[PDB]
Scaffold this active site. Structure first.
Site, mmCIF file in Angstrom:
data_model
loop_
_atom_site.group_PDB
_atom_site.id
_atom_site.type_symbol
_atom_site.label_atom_id
_atom_site.label_comp_id
_atom_site.label_asym_id
_atom_site.label_seq_id
_atom_site.Cartn_x
_atom_site.Cartn_y
_atom_site.Cartn_z
ATOM 1 N N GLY A 19 -1.164 10.271 -7.112
ATOM 2 C CA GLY A 19 -1.353 8.953 -6.555
ATOM 3 C C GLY A 19 -2.318 8.908 -5.388
ATOM 4 O O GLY A 19 -2.931 9.914 -5.014
ATOM 5 N N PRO A 20 -2.480 7.724 -4.798
ATOM 6 C CA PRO A 20 -3.380 7.570 -3.647
ATOM 7 C C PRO A 20 -2.860 8.322 -2.436
ATOM 8 O O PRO A 20 -1.643 8.511 -2.287
ATOM 9 C CB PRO A 20 -3.383 6.051 -3.400
ATOM 10 C CG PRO A 20 -2.881 5.446 -4.672
ATOM 11 C CD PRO A 20 -1.914 6.437 -5.233
ATOM 12 N N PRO A 21 -3.750 8.774 -1.551
ATOM 13 C CA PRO A 21 -3.297 9.504 -0.362
ATOM 14 C C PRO A 21 -2.600 8.582 0.627
ATOM 15 O O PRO A 21 -2.863 7.379 0.677
ATOM 16 C CB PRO A 21 -4.595 10.068 0.223
ATOM 17 C CG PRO A 21 -5.645 9.108 -0.221
ATOM 18 C CD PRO A 21 -5.214 8.601 -1.572
ATOM 19 N N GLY A 22 -1.707 9.166 1.423
ATOM 20 C CA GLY A 22 -0.966 8.423 2.418
ATOM 21 C C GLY A 22 0.296 7.752 1.923
ATOM 22 O O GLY A 22 0.955 7.055 2.705
ATOM 23 N N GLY A 82 2.789 9.405 1.037
ATOM 24 C CA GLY A 82 3.832 10.297 1.502
ATOM 25 C C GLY A 82 4.449 11.131 0.400
ATOM 26 O O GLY A 82 5.671 11.128 0.227
ATOM 27 N N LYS A 83 3.610 11.840 -0.359
ATOM 28 C CA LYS A 83 4.111 12.700 -1.427
ATOM 29 C C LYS A 83 4.937 13.851 -0.866
ATOM 30 O O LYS A 83 5.974 14.222 -1.429
ATOM 31 C CB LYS A 83 2.946 13.226 -2.262
ATOM 32 C CG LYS A 83 1.975 12.153 -2.712
ATOM 33 C CD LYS A 83 2.339 11.637 -4.091
ATOM 34 C CE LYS A 83 1.095 11.294 -4.886
ATOM 35 N NZ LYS A 83 0.338 12.515 -5.278
ATOM 36 N N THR A 84 4.483 14.437 0.246
ATOM 37 C CA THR A 84 5.270 15.472 0.905
ATOM 38 C C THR A 84 6.576 14.907 1.452
ATOM 39 O O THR A 84 7.585 15.618 1.507
ATOM 40 C CB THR A 84 4.453 16.129 2.021
ATOM 41 O OG1 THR A 84 5.307 16.947 2.828
ATOM 42 C CG2 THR A 84 3.780 15.076 2.896
ATOM 43 N N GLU A 142 -20.826 -19.904 7.180
ATOM 44 C CA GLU A 142 -19.423 -19.845 6.776
ATOM 45 C C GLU A 142 -18.992 -21.135 6.088
ATOM 46 O O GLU A 142 -18.186 -21.109 5.147
ATOM 47 C CB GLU A 142 -18.538 -19.554 7.988
ATOM 48 C CG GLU A 142 -18.836 -18.230 8.675
ATOM 49 C CD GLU A 142 -19.092 -17.104 7.694
ATOM 50 O OE1 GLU A 142 -18.213 -16.833 6.849
ATOM 51 O OE2 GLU A 142 -20.176 -16.488 7.767
#
Lengths: 240, 39, 498, 369, 327, 352, 209
Positions: free
Chosen positions: D52-55, D57-59, D274
């Site tokens: 998956g994407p980093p961050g 929290g796989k750990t 804008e």
């Protein structure tokens, strides 16, 4: 003297009959273990040539010179030291070798061989260091028949065996390949319970090797059921 | 390959700049081959 | 590892200038450092790391030293280049030792100068690299394992954000990222006030003009400005820093030192003089007549300095007018760019030279930028093209940084497919360049007297000023005969005294 | 050496789990009810891989599953295996698996396998040979010879295409679980668990904060929690509200808001730019829901911006209509339209040069798409 | 290992008879129509004059500073020498052959010929620096002890700081003192664009000399002067006519030495002392032909006509190109 | 021995060790190679002396690619020198085998071939080079019924028929794949507390094992009616074209609209036997290729095309170029042109 | 060490023609560089003939003079050498002309119409978009200026044919010539020099103020 050609043609036989008919000491080594380790990188070449000189006049014969005089010898310094030692022992020039160029102790012929003649360096095949080049090739049909007779003399052959009608099936085979073919025929002779080895054993061995060559390992039963699995018309098209 | 993360700001583009880059090179190579093999 | 344990670092927040936003942001760190109790009662997680990113000489190390001085906490300084070794594992041991010595005297500040030396990105474009990775692993382990309740703030100073690993930019290790912008006009003013208190100063030196006229110069560069001014005054045996010596330091560090008697032939200097004077005259005429939004000439010189055989000095305007570059402003600046070739074509008739080739290339590229990149005209175009040649924005020569820079496409380029519109773009660019060339040559050829008199005066004096050029323009109205200049007893004579 | 102590993280400590949590407790079942697993004749799957994407929290998931399993936890960085010396990494893996087998029952975790799981034959160097040796050693200690039935390996990678298909062979790494980016409820629960350690209020609605920060990882939500502590002492209020969270999200997704000197015509130009964007956007279906409209310069963008949140399902899958792109190109061209209609054709500026190229790039992608 | 073999190259000094034989050497067969006249090579004449001046100790007496006469004679002599460098570089290893001229000029030099090798200073990888410094200072002290002597340094391009320092202090100190000024430090390499500009000073290894490839008249002259020096007289039919000029090849150095040795071997096996056309043809056939087993010839006549026509055209039309044999 | 990864080479080696009844010596490839030289050679020669002492013996070396790697670049680190020292030492020990005293049989096993050095494979060292490939349908049936002895099923006949029907859809799968299908079905049954392996458990194991899912998220998404309609219309157009243009080998069987894919979610009944395919079959395939774009242009107009369904006539373009160039019953000619470079500039307008 | 050819007049005739043509076209261009010495070196690897020329912000006229000078040996070999005997000697000059002309078209803008269109810079790696059919126009421009310089060289070289023959035979019979000798030859035999202002095309020339 640079010998060249396909491997397994009996390049050692030429050097051995050279030594036998010439009646000389014959210094023989292998070029694989010359880049051995750090204990003696290029010192083996020097002690080789020193033993040759001390027993001169004689021959020097080294196997697989491509592992020493290959095109990547100038990259590795360990290879470079060995190549420099070999190319320095190849010539005279008394300095760094300490012996007169023209003497009985310097009457040494350096025989070298490989399986890749174009892989060697340009400065090793130069004249003065390597003068004569002998190219040994694969045998032809009659020599193949004689080799088949020689390597199958000590086996119980049948009466219908004749290798003259299978010479076209063994193009490019070396002596080791013919020996393997005879052993293959013997193994499938004893596997089927047969006492002798007819021509059909050799035919079956060649055919099974050809079938295995494209990656088909099937016994008879599975081949039969897979033949029965295919329909009739789509086999009729392959038949035409 | 259409920039799967949607842009929250309209200022961002809907497609990545490197999405259709092999086709640009293919068309340029084909046109250059046609130009060189005609003169 | 002689990490200097100084009770008083010797610098405070009064010693920093031009870093107002960053020091205002770091005031929170100072408040945490002096008394963390009110931080702890409400439950803040303080930033684990603060990364100071900016140009060199901006005093980021001075900023951290001032933070420690005002906070009254020990300051631990040891650079990133001190973490590189040949043996493996020693750098991680030094990281651990510095960290635990920081944990001894809590609160404390850890500062690593040039942190990108140990934190080089694994670019995919010896055993030292393994040492760098092990030191990075040890540093990130110590940073992630840092409990925020003990108040040990770690500072990292870097010069380049691109080569630093994104792992440290992840929250939990470097929570705060502060940019240290080069000081503004007021910032350079205050740095000049601080550095001028150390050396003797005369009342004739006006530091406001020097702060306004030296854009983007770092604090260390202002320090070398005042130091070389002191050394010039020593060379001249001056009792104090005069304005002449300060300007001498300016021309020594900006364009370079003056050579001694190194001049080419009389033809090799007339062409450069004609080119620079023509550029200056076009700029002044566009300012006078059509009221262009372009720069003003300060001085024009043909004395070789550094590696420029001649130079014309242009002031730098305010950056608020450097964002919406309109079509007329670009057209007048582009006329100013071809002013040199206009001068060669009107003065020498039809025998131009190679001294005005660079201005021609700049004009040719900005015509393409007007056409393709910005798409200012109104046939719509499908692609822009990158510049085949790239020249960096630089000193006294023409500004070419009106939109930040000239030779920098803003990633507005695509590979073309149709090759039939490329020639129509080329024809449009040629038409624009040719029409603009006829207009600039027509406007400059109408005033041959002022151009020729300015060339002669600059050749005699080897340097002219913008006010002298203005005086020549006023005293030589358009459509006066060249014989009026040619009947003078000295064409290269300036009766105006500054 | 590679053994860690004090592993108390459980499934309650981690949020944004979903049905993956079921697989997680299945792993716990593999560590508890394995008697009937082998009684029925099921070999316990050793290889489970989180991608998956980093961050995200796989750990952290590894610590959670190790704490819930109640076994020894090994957490080894894969960067230590690659080295300039050969043979030492193979011995490191041998010692790792030997001490894992001796400490059975246990679970072992190795993160970022892309460093050492690279396909052999992609780099020509001694490091490649050392990587091949370490990969071979871990392969043999995983499946090579008999002797392991109790040690289970968990791994965390980001790019699954880089891995050697030999490793992806079943019996070595057969369970492949993807950890997606948190959706709406996932961001809610991650914000809740990361904010449980701080005193919060009862009128604090996380729905607006979650809808404001769409498409972000759990580490970014922890960052939003980290910018919920530092910025209220400037005014000095009593209790945290949702306004501070909204401003923190606005600061994080764009940058800090800095004020500089500005003239009136510059403000007028940014305002009409804008206005062009928002006014052309509101009449189109895909960009109708404009929620914010400011001209304040931010970090990296001296212009303003218009905020829209279209449907994010058709965009990812590719079900955007042809008219949906002809509308967006018109939106990008409309700043130049306002500039031409207000300042005339001869006074075109260069402020819309960033949208005028996005329009032509979108048209080019459309015609050959 | 090199220091022992370079220390024993002359353990005893040259005998009086040897020095007397060398001191009265002669020109030896330059003025022949078959081999190597005066104007053919100017560089070898200059090197011969340099080594001859080295032989008679004519370099330690650097000048006279006398009234008018000896000064004029010395100026005329210094003119005639070139159209007194104590160190000469030669850069000519673009083709083949390096020692083939150095030993050819040193065989009659009678001085100790020491060839130090720089590659020994690279493979030794605070103990290496001391060993290398002691080794190089022992080489230089031995070279001084063998005065007069000739030092040859091949392949300078292998050069590391310690040997550079040794060479710069040697060429800065041993040219205004160290009484045996006639110490030649001749050196050769194959790349001249990589040497540092600090080693091309007028006082430090000057007077670069080039060596080019061998042309056909030069090939004939070198072959004749290499065959004649071994008691083998060239037969007066191939150099007396256009016989062996049209068949000779190997337009490079070290390709004529092997050919000469093969031809001499073939004539020796016949117990002869003259070389005919057949001996040269059989020597050329044994070098550019490969021995082969399982011999087979062409089974389709029709490629024979291709070779016949090309050979006839190459014979008649291009009268300055060789013809390889047809088979 | 060599072949596809996880085909049973280690199982075959264990079977050799078990059924041989000879002294078996299991070794490892990367066990010998270290940074210090001489360790690998000493270990291997001690092993060879031990095998010679206990002749006859079966020395098996797993993963010879660790030391048998061919020189393919400069070994700056120096471990390649140790690897080559060990390799040549193995070669010398192999060549030191006299046929009258050393009855030692070497059994190799590798997962790669191109990185090996062609000296071990030479004569006298490795004569037999066999390869265990993917088993046939009978081989797949044999391996699944071998792996299903301890596996509890409802009945022997039900087990046999389930094994046969999963054997018919496990093509291009090795022994590890079938064993893991059975293992995952056992995991599902033990999780669901069902004592026997049901059919749906096999179906879910097959669904997992071919990797149909790639998002791997919580599948709870409210699909708009505009998407269900597009998928239903695409699937219905495919059904109509397939029924009107009958393919003699792939009849339509099942149709779902539950997934978003670049290709339609249709299922065909695969019957092997495509020996022949006529020009009409190629034309029908070209027609069937560009169905979604036509159906979306017809009902919903041109301005409502998706990015996916408009990327459907591109495959028709590829198929038509294949028909014109590489089949040879068109009027373009009777040659076989490979699209890369044997397309001279005269045939380009004809092809277009 | 050895010359590659003997000292015969049939060998030295092309080199004498080459050197004499270069020296003559150097002489006839006004305010150009000064030719000093001509000789035939028997052992020079560059060639038998050798010519010494000493140079006198280079303007447009200097580059035009260099470009027209770059044709002298080629045109001299064209009138003088008999058919059947050609040279590859002037080739290294003619490509130099092929280098010189484009520089006034791309780099410096000294094109056929005095256009300020610039498509190349000193530090450039490539050119601009350059069009597809626009390349033919500038190619025609470059061929035009190259042919204009060629025809200028031909017109001012064919009017000193006998002077060129005189210089060739004096070079062949003396093997050394100096600037004074060349001056004597062009004075006795009637050499005609060019006059300022020097332009390749007078259709756009102007006068300085």
């Amino acid at each position: 003297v640079l010998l060249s050609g396909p491997p397994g043609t009996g390049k050692t036989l030429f050097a051995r009959t050279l030594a036998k008919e010439s009646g000389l000491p014959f210094v023989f080594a292998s070029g694989a273990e010359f880049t051995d380790s750090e204990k003696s990188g290029a010192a083996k070449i020097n002690e080789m040539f020193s033993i040759a000189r001390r027993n001169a006049p004689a021959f020097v014969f080294v196997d697989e010179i491509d592992a020493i005089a290959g095109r990547h010898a100038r990259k590795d310094p360990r290879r470079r030291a060995t190549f420099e030692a070999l190319i320095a022992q190849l010539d005279g020039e008394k300095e760094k070798t300490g012996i007169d160029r023209f003497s009985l102790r310097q009457a040494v012929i350096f025989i070298c061989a490989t399986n890749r003649p174009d892989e060697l360096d340009l400065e090793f095949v130069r004249s003065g260091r390597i003068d004569r080049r002998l190219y040994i090739g694969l045998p032809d049909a009659k020599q193949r028949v004689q080799i088949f007779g020689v390597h199958s003399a000590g086996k119980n052959l049948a009466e219908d065996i004749d290798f003259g009608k299978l010479v076209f099936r063994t193009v490019g085979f070396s002596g080791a390949d013919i020996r393997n073919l005879v052993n293959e025929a013997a193994i499938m002779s004893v596997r089927k319970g047969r006492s002798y080895i007819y021509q059909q054993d050799i035919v079956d061995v060649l055919d099974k090797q050809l079938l295995e060559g494209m990656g088909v390992l099937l016994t008879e039963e599975e081949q039969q059921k897979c033949e029965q699995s295919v329909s009739y018309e789509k086999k009729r098209l392959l038949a035409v | 390959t259409s920039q799967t993360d949607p842009p929250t700001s309209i200022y961002k583009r809907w497609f990545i700049k490197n999405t259709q880059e092999k086709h640009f090179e293919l068309l340029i190579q084909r046109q250059r081959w046609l130009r060189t093999n005609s003169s | 590892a002689e990490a200097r344990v100084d009770g008083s670092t010797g610098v405070k927040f009064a010693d920093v200038a031009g870093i107002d936003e960053a020091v205002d942001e770091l005031q929170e760190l100072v408040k945490y450092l002096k008394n963390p109790d009110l931080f702890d009662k409400m439950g803040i997680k303080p930033p684990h790391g603060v990364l100071l990113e900016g140009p060199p000489g901006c005093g980021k190390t001075l900023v951290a030293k001032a933070i420690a001085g005002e906070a009254g906490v020990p300051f631990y300084q040891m650079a990133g280049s001190e973490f590189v070794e040949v043996l493996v594992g020693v750098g991680s041991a030094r990281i651990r030792d510095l960290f635990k010595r920081a944990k001894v005297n809590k609160p404390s500040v850890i500062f690593i100068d040039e942190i990108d030396a140990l934190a080089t990105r694994r670019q995919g474009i010896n055993a030292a690299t393994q040492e760098r990775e092990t030191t990075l692993n040890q540093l990130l382990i110590e940073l992630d394992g840092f409990d925020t309740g003990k108040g040990v703030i770690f500072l990292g100073a870097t010069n380049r954000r691109d080569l630093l690993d994104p792992a440290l930019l992840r929250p939990g290790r470097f929570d705060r990222k502060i940019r240290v912008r080069p000081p503004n006009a007021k910032g350079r003013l205050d740095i000049l006030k601080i550095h001028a208190s150390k050396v003797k100063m005369s009342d004739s030196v006006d530091l406001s003009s020097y702060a306004s006229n030296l854009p983007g110069w770092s604090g260390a560069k202002l320090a070398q400005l005042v130091q070389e001014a002191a050394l010039v005054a020593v060379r001249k045996t001056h009792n104090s820093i005069l304005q002449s010596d300060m300007d001498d330091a300016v021309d020594r560090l900006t364009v370079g030192p003056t050579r001694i008697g190194l001049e080419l032939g009389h033809q090799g200097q007339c062409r450069r003089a004609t080119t620079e004077v023509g550029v200056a005259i076009t700029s002044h005429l566009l300012l006078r007549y059509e009221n262009a939004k372009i720069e003003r000439c300060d001085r024009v010189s043909i004395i070789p300095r550094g590696q420029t055989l001649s130079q014309v000095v242009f002031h730098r305007l305010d950056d608020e007018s450097y964002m919406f570059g309109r079509l007329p402003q670009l057209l007048h600046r582009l006329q100013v760019l071809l002013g040199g070739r206009a001068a060669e074509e009107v003065i020498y008739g039809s025998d131009t030279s190679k001294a005005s080739v660079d201005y021609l290339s700049d004009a040719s590229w900005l015509a393409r930028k007007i056409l393709t990149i910005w798409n200012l005209e109104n046939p719509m175009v499908i692609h822009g093209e990158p510049p085949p040649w790239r020249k960096r924005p630089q000193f006294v020569g023409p500004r070419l940084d009106f939109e930040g820079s000239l030779y920098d496409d803003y990633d507005l380029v695509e590979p073309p497919v149709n090759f039939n519109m490329d020639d129509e773009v080329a024809h449009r660019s040629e038409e624009l360049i040719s029409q603009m060339y006829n207009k600039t040559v027509s406007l400059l050829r109408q005033n041959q007297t002022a151009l020729l008199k300015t060339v002669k005066v600059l050749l005699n004096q080897k340097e002219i000023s913008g006010e002298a050029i203005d005086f020549i323009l006023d005293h030589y109205p358009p459509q006066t005969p060249l014989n009026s200049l040619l009947q003078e007893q000295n064409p290269g004579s300036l009766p105006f005294v500054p | 050496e590679y053994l860690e102590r004090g592993v108390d993280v459980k499934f309650t400590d981690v949020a944004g789990l979903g049905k993956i949590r079921l697989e997680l407790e299945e792993i716990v079942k593999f560590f508890t009810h394995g008697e009937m697993y082998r009684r029925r004749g099921v070999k316990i799957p050793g290889g489970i891989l989180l991608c998956g994407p980093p961050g995200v929290g796989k750990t952290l998931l590894a610590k959670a599953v190790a704490g819930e399993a109640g076994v020894n936890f090994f957490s080894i960085s894969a960067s230590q295996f690659v080295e300039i010396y050969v043979g030492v990494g193979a011995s490191r893996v041998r010692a790792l698996y030997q001490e894992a087998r001796e400490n059975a029952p246990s679970v072992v975790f190795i993160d970022e396998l892309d460093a050492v799981g690279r396909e052999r034959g992609l780099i020509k160097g001694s490091g490649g040979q050392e990587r091949d040796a370490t990969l071979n050693q871990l392969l043999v200690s995983l499946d090579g010879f008999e002797g392991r039935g109790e040690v289970i390996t968990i791994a965390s990678t980001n790019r699954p295409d880089i891995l050697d298909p030999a490793l992806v062979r079943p019996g070595r790494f057969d369970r492949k679980i993807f950890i997606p980016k948190p959706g709406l409820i996932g961001r809610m629960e991650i914000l809740q668990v990361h904010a449980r350690k701080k005193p919060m209020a009862e009128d604090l609605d996380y729905m607006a904060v979650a809808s404001m920060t769409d498409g972000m990882v759990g580490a970014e939500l922890a960052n939003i929690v980290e910018i919920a502590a530092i910025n209220m002492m400037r005014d000095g209020r009593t209790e945290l509200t949702t306004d501070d969270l909204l401003q923190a999200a606005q600061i994080e997704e764009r940058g800090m808001l800095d004020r500089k000197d500005r003239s009136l015509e510059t403000w007028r130009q940014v305002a009409i730019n804008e206005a062009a964007m928002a006014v052309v956007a509101v009449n189109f279906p895909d960009m109708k829901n404009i929620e914010f409209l400011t001209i304040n310069p931010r970090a990296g963008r001296e212009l303003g911006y218009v905020r829209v949140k279209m449907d994010h399902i058709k965009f990812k899958e590719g079900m955007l209509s042809r008219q949906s792109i002809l509308d967006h190109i018109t939106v990008q061209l409309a700043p130049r339209a306002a500039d031409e209609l207000w300042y005339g054709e001869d006074q075109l500026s260069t402020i819309w040069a960033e949208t005028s190229d996005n329009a032509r790039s979108a048209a080019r992608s459309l015609v050959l798409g | 290992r090199e220091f022992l073999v370079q220390f024993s190259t002359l353990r005893a000094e040259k005998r009086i008879d040897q020095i007397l034989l060398s001191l009265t050497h002669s020109d030896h067969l330059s003025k022949n129509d078959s081999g190597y006249q005066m104007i053919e090579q100017p560089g070898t004449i200059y090197l011969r004059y340099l080594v001859d001046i080295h032989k008679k100790y004519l370099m330690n007496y650097e000048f006279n500073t006398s009234c008018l006469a000896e000064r004029r004679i010395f100026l005329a002599h210094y003119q005639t020498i070139t159209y007194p460098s104590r160190s000469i570089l030669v850069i000519g290893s673009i083709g083949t052959g390096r020692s083939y001229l150095v030993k050819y000029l040193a065989t009659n030099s009678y001085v100790p010929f020491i060839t130090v090798f720089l590659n020994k200073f690279l493979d030794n990888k605070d103990m290496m620096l001391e060993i290398d410094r002691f080794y190089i200072t022992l080489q230089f002290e031995l070279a001084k002890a063998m005065s007069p002597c000739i030092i040859w340094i091949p392949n300078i391009h292998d050069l590391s700081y310690l040997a550079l320092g040794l060479l710069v202090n040697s060429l800065s100190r041993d040219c205004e003192r160290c009484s045996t000024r006639n110490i030649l430090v001749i050196a050769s390499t194959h790349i001249p664009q990589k040497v540092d500009p600090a080693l091309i000073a007028p006082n430090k290894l000057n007077t670069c000399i080039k060596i080019r490839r061998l042309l056909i008249p030069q090939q004939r002259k070198h072959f004749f002067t290499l065959s004649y020096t071994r008691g083998f007289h060239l037969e007066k039919k191939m150099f007396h006519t256009n016989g062996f000029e049209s068949i000779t090849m190997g337009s490079s150095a070290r390709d004529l030495v092997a050919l000469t040795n093969e031809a001499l071997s073939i004539s020796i096996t016949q117990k002869k002392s003259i070389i005919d056309t057949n001996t040269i043809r059989s020597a050329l056939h044994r070098q550019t032909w490969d021995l082969r087993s399982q011999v087979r010839s062409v089974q389709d006549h029709g490629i024979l006509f291709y070779q016949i026509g090309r050979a006839v055209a190459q014979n008649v039309l291009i009268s300055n190109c060789p013809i390889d044999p047809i088979s | 021995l060599h072949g596809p990864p996880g085909t049973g080479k280690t199982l075959l080696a264990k079977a050799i060790a078990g059924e041989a009844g000879l002294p078996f010596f299991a070794a490892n490839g990367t066990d010998f190679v270290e940074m210090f030289v001489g360790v690998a050679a000493s270990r291997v020669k001690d092993l060879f002396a031990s095998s010679r002492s206990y002749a006859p013996s079966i020395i098996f070396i797993d993963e010879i690619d660790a030391i048998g790697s061919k020189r393919g670049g400069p070994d700056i680190g120096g471990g390649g020198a140790e690897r080559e020292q060990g390799l040549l030492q193995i070669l010398t020990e192999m060549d030191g085998f006299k046929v009258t005293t050393s009855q030692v049989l070497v059994i190799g096993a590798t997962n790669r071939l191109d990185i090996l050095d062609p000296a071990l494979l030479r004569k006298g060292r490795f004569d037999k080079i066999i390869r265990v490939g993917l088993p046939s349908k009978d081989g797949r049936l044999a391996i699944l019924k071998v792996h299903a002895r301890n596996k509890f099923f409802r009945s022997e006949d039900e087990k046999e028929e389930l094994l046969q029907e999963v054997a018919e859809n496990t093509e291009d799968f090795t022994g590890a794949e079938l064993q893991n299908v059975l293992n995952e079905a056992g995991i599902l049954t033990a999780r669901k507390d069902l004592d026997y392996i049901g059919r749906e458990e096999l179906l879910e194991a097959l669904k997992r094992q071919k990797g149909t899912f790639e998002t791997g998220q919580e599948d709870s998404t409210e699909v708009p009616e505009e998407l269900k309609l597009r998928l239903a219309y695409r699937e219905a157009a495919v059904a109509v074209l397939a029924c009107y243009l009958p393919d003699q080998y792939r009849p339509i069987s099942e149709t779902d609209i539950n997934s978003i894919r670049s290709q339609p979610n249709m299922r065909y009944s695969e019957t092997s036997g495509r020996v022949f395919a006529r020009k009409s079959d190629y034309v029908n395939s070209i027609i069937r290729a560009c169905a979604p774009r036509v159906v979306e242009e017809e009902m919903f107009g041109i301005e409502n095309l998706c990015w996916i369904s408009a990327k459907s006539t591109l495959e028709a373009s590829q198929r038509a170029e294949f028909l014109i160039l590489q089949t040879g019953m068109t009027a373009f000619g009777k040659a076989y042109y490979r699209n890369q470079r044997d397309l001279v500039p005269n045939l380009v307008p004809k092809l277009e | 060490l050895n010359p590659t050819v003997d000292w015969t007049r049939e060998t030295k005739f092309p080199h004498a023609v080459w050197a004499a043509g270069r020296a003559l076209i150097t002489l006839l261009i006004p305010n150009f560089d000064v030719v000093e010495n001509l000789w035939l070196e028997p052992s020079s690897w560059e060639g038998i003939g050798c010519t010494k020329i000493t140079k006198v912000t280079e303007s447009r006229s200097y580059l035009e003079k260099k470009l027209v000078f770059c044709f002298g040996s080629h045109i001299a070999s064209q009138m003088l050498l008999p058919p059947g005997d050609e040279n590859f000697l002037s080739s290294s000059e003619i490509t130099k002309a092929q280098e010189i002309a484009t520089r006034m078209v791309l780099q410096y803008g000294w094109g056929p119409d005095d256009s300020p269109a610039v498509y190349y810079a000193t530090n450039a790696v490539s050119a601009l978009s350059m069009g597809n059919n626009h390349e033919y126009e500038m190619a025609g421009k470059v061929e035009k200026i190259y042919d204009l310089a060629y025809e200028k060289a031909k017109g001012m070289l064919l009017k000193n044919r006998r002077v060129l023959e005189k210089i060739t035979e004096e070079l062949l019979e003396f093997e050394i010539l100096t600037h004074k000798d060349l001056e004597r030859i062009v004075h006795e035999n009637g050499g005609i020099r060019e006059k300022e202002p020097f332009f390749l095309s007078g259709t756009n020339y102007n006068e300085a103020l």
